[PDB]
Design a protein around this ligand. Structure first.
Ligand SMILES: CC(=O)N[C@@H]1[C@@H](O)[C@H](O[C@@H]2O[C@H](CO)[C@@H](O[C@@H]3O[C@H](CO)[C@@H](O)[C@H](O)[C@H]3NC(C)=O)[C@H](O)[C@H]2NC(C)=O)[C@@H](CO)O[C@H]1O
Length: 129
């Protein structure tokens, strides 16, 4: 599924991401835009053998288990295929766990390069939440 911006913001809001660990909602909408262009099916394979899965590009070396990544820690205790669902619940619950690390949202490279530091509140304006 490819989510609309406001559609995704609302889905994320109802799952507890607004101001999760300080981070306002537009941070997560901006992270999903530059990570996958709001597409739940996005996958990117990395040269170390891990793959990034779903709308928030969660990595299989640390967070989910896909069967093919040497040394997967599977810290979110999920199959990576669960992250390719049109339902984002599994992705958001894992993302909360990722964001709880010392690095916070810097675990998302696209958010640190294209979102961090800007007025990310723009990503939810016009959405009547
Ligand atoms: C969205 C996504 O999947 N992003 C992936 C990143 O999460 C991943 O970054 C690595 O994440 C781990 C776990 O949060 C980092 O480990 C922490 O590192 C510090 C020192 O930097 C250490 O003291 C902590 O104890 C340790 N935390 C845990 C829970 O073990 C690790 O440093 C991150 N590494 C880098 C280079 O950022 C990266 C790379 O595997 O992939 C993203 O796709």
């Amino acid at each position: 599924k490819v989510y609309g911006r406001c559609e995704l913001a609302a889905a994320m809001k109802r799952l507890g991401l607004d101001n999760y660990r300080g981070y306002s909602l537009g941070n997560w909408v901006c992270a999903a835009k530059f990570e996958s262009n709001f597409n739940t099916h996005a996958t990117n394979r990395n040269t170390d053998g891990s793959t990034d899965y779903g709308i928030l590009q969660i990595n299989s070396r640390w967070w989910c288990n896909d069967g093919r990544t040497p040394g997967s820690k599977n810290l979110c205790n999920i199959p990576c295929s669960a992250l390719l669902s049109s339902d984002i619940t599994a992705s958001v619950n894992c993302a909360k766990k990722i964001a709880s690390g010392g690095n916070g949202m810097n675990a998302w490279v696209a958010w640190r390069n294209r979102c961090k530091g800007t007025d990310v509140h723009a990503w939810i304006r016009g959405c009547r939440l």
